[PDB]
Enzyme design. Structure first.
Site, PDB file in Angstrom:
ATOM      1  CD1 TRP B  95      -1.684   2.337   1.903  1.00  0.00           C
ATOM      2  CD2 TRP B  95      -3.026   1.350   0.405  1.00  0.00           C
ATOM      3  NE1 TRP B  95      -2.674   3.228   1.586  1.00  0.00           N
ATOM      4  CE2 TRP B  95      -3.514   2.653   0.668  1.00  0.00           C
ATOM      5  CE3 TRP B  95      -3.708   0.543  -0.510  1.00  0.00           C
ATOM      6  CZ2 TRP B  95      -4.659   3.169   0.046  1.00  0.00           C
ATOM      7  CZ3 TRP B  95      -4.845   1.053  -1.131  1.00  0.00           C
ATOM      8  CH2 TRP B  95      -5.309   2.362  -0.847  1.00  0.00           C
ATOM      9  CE1 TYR B  96       4.769   6.107   3.053  1.00  0.00           C
ATOM     10  CE2 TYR B  96       6.583   4.896   2.022  1.00  0.00           C
ATOM     11  CZ  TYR B  96       6.077   6.055   2.603  1.00  0.00           C
ATOM     12  OH  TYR B  96       6.883   7.167   2.730  1.00  0.00           O
ATOM     13  CD  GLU B 142      -2.389  -2.973  -1.382  1.00  0.00           C
ATOM     14  OE1 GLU B 142      -3.605  -2.966  -1.091  1.00  0.00           O
ATOM     15  OE2 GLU B 142      -1.464  -3.032  -0.542  1.00  0.00           O
ATOM     16  CE1 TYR B 143      -6.114  -2.154  -3.975  1.00  0.00           C
ATOM     17  CE2 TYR B 143      -5.338  -4.344  -4.589  1.00  0.00           C
ATOM     18  CZ  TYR B 143      -5.806  -3.455  -3.629  1.00  0.00           C
ATOM     19  OH  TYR B 143      -5.911  -3.868  -2.319  1.00  0.00           O
ATOM     20  CG  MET B 210      -4.192  -8.222   0.245  1.00  0.00           C
ATOM     21  SD  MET B 210      -3.358  -6.679  -0.246  1.00  0.00           S
ATOM     22  CE  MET B 210      -3.847  -6.547  -1.979  1.00  0.00           C
ATOM     23  CD1 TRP B 401      -0.672  -6.919   7.777  1.00  0.00           C
ATOM     24  CD2 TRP B 401       0.884  -7.191   6.183  1.00  0.00           C
ATOM     25  NE1 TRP B 401       0.218  -5.862   7.871  1.00  0.00           N
ATOM     26  CE2 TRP B 401       1.181  -6.006   6.907  1.00  0.00           C
ATOM     27  CE3 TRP B 401       1.724  -7.567   5.130  1.00  0.00           C
ATOM     28  CZ2 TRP B 401       2.290  -5.189   6.607  1.00  0.00           C
ATOM     29  CZ3 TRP B 401       2.829  -6.761   4.828  1.00  0.00           C
ATOM     30  CH2 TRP B 401       3.100  -5.580   5.569  1.00  0.00           C
TER      31      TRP B 401
HETATM   32  O1  CHQ Z   1       0.867  -3.055   2.263  1.00  0.00           O
HETATM   33  C1  CHQ Z   1       0.279  -3.960   2.855  1.00  0.00           C
HETATM   34  N1  CHQ Z   1      -0.533  -3.655   3.956  1.00  0.00           N
HETATM   35  C2  CHQ Z   1      -1.314  -4.664   4.689  1.00  0.00           C
HETATM   36  C3  CHQ Z   1      -2.726  -4.105   4.904  1.00  0.00           C
HETATM   37  C4  CHQ Z   1      -3.507  -3.882   3.602  1.00  0.00           C
HETATM   38  C5  CHQ Z   1      -2.997  -3.544   2.416  1.00  0.00           C
HETATM   39  N2  CHQ Z   1      -3.973  -3.450   1.512  1.00  0.00           N
HETATM   40  C6  CHQ Z   1      -5.073  -3.740   2.196  1.00  0.00           C
HETATM   41  N3  CHQ Z   1      -4.827  -4.010   3.473  1.00  0.00           N
HETATM   42  C7  CHQ Z   1      -1.422  -5.991   3.930  1.00  0.00           C
HETATM   43  O2  CHQ Z   1      -2.284  -6.800   4.274  1.00  0.00           O
HETATM   44  N4  CHQ Z   1      -0.580  -6.326   2.862  1.00  0.00           N
HETATM   45  C8  CHQ Z   1      -0.696  -7.477   1.938  1.00  0.00           C
HETATM   46  C9  CHQ Z   1       0.373  -7.161   0.887  1.00  0.00           C
HETATM   47  C10 CHQ Z   1       0.435  -5.631   0.924  1.00  0.00           C
HETATM   48  C11 CHQ Z   1       0.494  -5.416   2.437  1.00  0.00           C
HETATM   49  O1  CHQ Z   2      -7.399   4.012   3.665  1.00  0.00           O
HETATM   50  C1  CHQ Z   2      -7.306   2.892   3.160  1.00  0.00           C
HETATM   51  N1  CHQ Z   2      -6.340   1.986   3.619  1.00  0.00           N
HETATM   52  C2  CHQ Z   2      -6.113   0.702   2.937  1.00  0.00           C
HETATM   53  C3  CHQ Z   2      -5.525  -0.307   3.927  1.00  0.00           C
HETATM   54  C4  CHQ Z   2      -4.208   0.163   4.551  1.00  0.00           C
HETATM   55  C5  CHQ Z   2      -3.181  -0.627   4.863  1.00  0.00           C
HETATM   56  N2  CHQ Z   2      -2.207   0.095   5.415  1.00  0.00           N
HETATM   57  C6  CHQ Z   2      -2.690   1.331   5.419  1.00  0.00           C
HETATM   58  N3  CHQ Z   2      -3.908   1.415   4.898  1.00  0.00           N
HETATM   59  C7  CHQ Z   2      -7.440   0.159   2.395  1.00  0.00           C
HETATM   60  O2  CHQ Z   2      -7.606  -1.056   2.306  1.00  0.00           O
HETATM   61  N4  CHQ Z   2      -8.455   1.029   1.968  1.00  0.00           N
HETATM   62  C8  CHQ Z   2      -9.843   0.710   1.563  1.00  0.00           C
HETATM   63  C9  CHQ Z   2     -10.380   2.094   1.184  1.00  0.00           C
HETATM   64  C10 CHQ Z   2      -9.661   3.000   2.187  1.00  0.00           C
HETATM   65  C11 CHQ Z   2      -8.232   2.482   2.013  1.00  0.00           C
END
Ligand code: CHQ
Ligand code: CHQ
Ligand code: CHQ
Ligand code: CHQ
Lengths: 496, 497
Positions: B95-96, B142-143, B210, B401
């Site tokens: 994500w970051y 993502e994504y 995820m 995760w």
């Molecule tokens: O960046 C991440 N963040 C966490 C949380 C999350 C991310 N996107 C949705 N949720 C994760 O599960 N991850 C699965 C692989 C990416 C990694």
């Molecule tokens: O703010 C979000 N955050 C990510 C998850 C995340 C993981 N680490 C940081 N954020 C997500 O799944 N999202 C769903 C829609 C909002 C957006």
């Protein structure tokens, strides 16, 4: 710009071959009945019908006496002496020849198949036009199906190219040869080619909607066959257009095609205007000069919206001519259709009919309480609303089937001409009513709107509006981080 | 076939640079916490995260002490001595780095643009893999969306080609280099590339969904973040897949994408299976080893489906740490997320939490009546239903995760391993419940049906069924004289045997 007034002149082969203007028992409606006054009220007469033969060319019915045919056509073209804007078109097809189960259907499908079949076909259309003295080509295929649409389009484009060349070659810049088609006036048939409406209409001067026969014996509940607007008390229908091959999203399909909906003249017109590239000025509203009769209806709503016992087959599968007072029905062995001419006579005859008016659909109807009959038709009154709608919606004009069904004085034709052109007719106060309007919104009729310019990098909540690439867009859900057009979270909802 | 058990090992650059296995204050979860027993319970460890730089090549964060990075990775690859099936993958993105507004987003978009950029990027993925000793490549963008998907697909295909050649070159046939991706677990993000799922998944060994974070502070109603099945009493959502560029008719979209629907793990899995060419064996169900907490919740329903007053900003915009007993939250400065390890400690700390269970969603939740708190998380019990689902649905396995959030004993990982492989665990009688199942059906997952062959020249009434050109079709209105196919009147409803 003068509104088009396109009237069909239909004459069966047997009448052509026995053509006479002095014996209605043989030719009920000879060309001489189209007096100079009537010729001046028309802009077009669609001579009908010609067909496409097994040789895949435009042609008359084989049984036709050519000298007789030419003489009939010449009488029609002679009317131009009374009206310099008059055009005598000839129409190819019609329901009988071209419906899926019609005798010549295969020829329509095959004629548009290839560049060569199309070239040969297009050439025959122009050849027939020039040889007989017609002023344009009208094609009434009811109707090309999805896979046949591209061929159909290509054929129209070819005919247009040839007609434009012929207009120059004949010095007809003042009254160019024209190309038109009779298009579906109901969503079910329209859905066959709806997705390519813009391409179909591009080569045409007009698309004449058959916005009638929207009710018939094939339907379980009696209804107005040409209601301008909808009546919530009447039946509603499945909106077939949401199933057309548009490639639109669920949201886009849903807002453009509410379902169920009221099958009305307004619905068909609006459905055409919803497509981009379909100019209002090319849309012509068709109206019927005949009524449809149903038997076995019950009371409560004057025969409207009732079950019935009317045979839907063709030919009329019986010898029971139950539409009281309808003489032409016996002549034509069918009590399910009656010309306005005959209907007017039935009303002044004390036969038991009551003329009623539905103020939502803005159309009249007859109810025979004693025998359980219902008739849906149009008259000079319903034409006031249709004519105003044509003007308000900036449509190209009106088309009607057919000249021989107007009364002897040509009142229906005269009413249409009056509404468009009489200096002393004023419909500024004519109330269009509260009947249901078709509210679908498509790419072609997006409302003008304003919204802040979209800003790259901004995150928008659900329902936010922004302007981008010339349109106003709204988000379908929240946390939108991309741009309209690249992110399927945006719905185009306005323009400018 | 053994189910995959893919666990993320995530370590921030500052922890790598100051790596130590004797100070949890510096490195809360050193590789040394992964014992031989845990290594044997895993089939893959996804080391995370690497990124894509401005030169458009896979690369470590520039601030990384390279020697320290190799040492951390070495510690992980050393675990292979305990499990000949174990793979230490490395993940690019997350994500970051890769979200639309992320610091490196542009690099992802640009790297997949042309045959040249894709070749350069793919070669760099393999070079990094071989230089540091990883066993495969995992990409977590993502994504990608819109016009980016074709490039992304072509990039994946290129990496696959390079990895397969590397496998031969290295004599690695017994444990081939692999390629996987972390995929959206919810319909909103999924709609970005949904229409091309088959092509995306073709070059992959697995697509790891995820399927969590389905609830969060950004939502107005509290809910389970990873419900297996739906609860009719919980919130429902707009089905965004209805807006994907599929070219389906209104009836087809409606039939495939019921809306509103329950945003659940089963919904994501079924949505992927609805698409033709997506094998169940490549789908991996992701599960969270952490819970999400909300404050300001109302009682009456254990804090479920209530209004709340939880900040949504990121980072946490306040200094107020209200998740009672969560000291990890104070350390991490956010009371909205808690590791299962921490949640378990809170349940043993007599802090006033009630552990409740939703038998429709098959997930647990915490409720703090006194303070008005709600926590949605997963545990060994919810994993029994998810593991049975993975088995019944013939999915490829489970992903989670992250490793650092399991308790010290590695209980959640041990449970997953037990449910899939223990001879003494028997879920044959585990009742999957009556929660709502996702039931959409797409032109790509139609049931076998039987009907008379279409007869040209026949007029069909509404609702009539015929077989024609490999499918069974139903008329949507009456007086049909047209043949089944593009013609709008006919709807594909089944496949001919
Ligand atoms: O960046 C991440 N963040 C966490 C949380 C999350 C991310 N996107 C949705 N949720 C994760 O599960 N991850 C699965 C692989 C990416 C990694
Ligand atoms: O703010 C979000 N955050 C990510 C998850 C995340 C993981 N680490 C940081 N954020 C997500 O799944 N999202 C769903 C829609 C909002 C957006
Ligand atoms: O064939 C036709 N028959 C009649 C009736 C009808 C046809 N299609 C729908 N309704 C008509 O109005 N027409 C308008 C042009 C075709 C000619
Ligand atoms: O029978 C039909 N008749 C045409 C109209 C028509 C004009 N002249 C003869 N028929 C129609 O609209 N249909 C609607 C469905 C039944 C079919």
């Amino acid at each position: 710009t003068r509104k088009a007034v396109i009237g069909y002149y239909f004459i069966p082969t047997n009448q052509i071959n026995n053509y006479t203007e002095t014996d209605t028992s043989v030719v009920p409606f000879p060309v001489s009945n189209i007096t100079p006054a009537k010729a001046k009220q028309l802009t077009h007469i669609n001579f009908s019908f010609l067909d496409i033969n097994s040789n895949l060319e435009c042609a008359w019915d084989p049984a036709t006496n050519d000298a007789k045919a030419r003489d009939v056509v010449n009488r029609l073209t002679a009317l131009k002496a009374h009206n310099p804007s008059l055009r005598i078109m000839f129409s190819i097809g019609g329901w009988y020849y071209s419906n899926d189960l019609g005798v010549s259907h295969a020829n329509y499908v095959n004629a548009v198949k290839t560049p060569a079949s199309r070239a040969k076909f297009a050439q025959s259309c122009v050849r027939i036009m020039k040889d007989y003295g017609f002023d344009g080509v009208d094609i009434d295929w009811e109707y090309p199906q999805a896979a046949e649409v591209d061929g159909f389009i290509a054929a129209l484009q070819e005919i247009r190219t040839l007609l434009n060349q012929q207009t120059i070659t004949d010095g007809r810049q003042a009254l160019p040869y024209q190309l038109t088609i009779a298009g579906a006036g109901g969503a079910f048939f329209l859905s066959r080619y709806y997705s390519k409406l813009a391409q179909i209409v591009a080569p045409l001067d007009y698309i004449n909607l058959m916005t009638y026969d929207l009710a018939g014996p094939w339907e379980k509940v009696t209804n107005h066959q040409a209601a301008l607007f909808g009546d919530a008390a009447g039946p509603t229908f499945y909106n077939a257009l949401r199933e057309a091959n548009l490639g639109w999203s669920w949201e886009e399909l849903t807002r453009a095609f509410p379902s169920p909906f009221s099958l009305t003249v307004d619905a068909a017109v609006q459905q055409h205007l919803m497509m981009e590239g379909v100019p209002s000025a090319k849309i012509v509203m068709g109206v019927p000069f005949y009524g449809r009769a149903f038997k076995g209806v019950s009371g409560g709503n004057g025969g409207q919206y009732s079950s019935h016992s009317t045979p839907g087959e063709d030919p009329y599968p019986s010898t029971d001519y139950w539409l009281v007072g309808c003489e032409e029905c016996v002549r034509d062995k069918d009590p399910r259709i009656a010309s306005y001419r005959q209907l007017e006579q039935m009303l002044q005859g004390n036969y038991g009919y009551q003329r009623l008016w539905n103020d939502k659909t803005k159309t009249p109807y007859l109810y025979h309480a004693q025998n359980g009959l219902f008739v849906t038709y149009d008259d000079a009154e319903s034409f006031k609303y249709k004519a105003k709608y044509i003007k308000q919606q900036q449509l190209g004009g009106v088309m009607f089937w057919h000249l021989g069904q107007d009364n002897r004085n040509g009142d229906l034709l005269a009413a249409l001409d009056r509404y468009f052109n009489a200096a002393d007719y004023d419909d500024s106060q004519l109330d269009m009513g509260t009947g249901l309007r078709y509210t679908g919104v498509g790419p072609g009729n997006l409302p003008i709107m304003t919204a802040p310019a979209y800003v790259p990098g901004t995150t928008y909540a659900q329902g936010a509006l922004v302007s981008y690439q010339g349109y106003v867009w709204q988000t379908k859900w929240g946390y939108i981080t991309s741009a309209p057009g690249s992110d399927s979270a945006w719905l185009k909802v306005g323009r400018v």
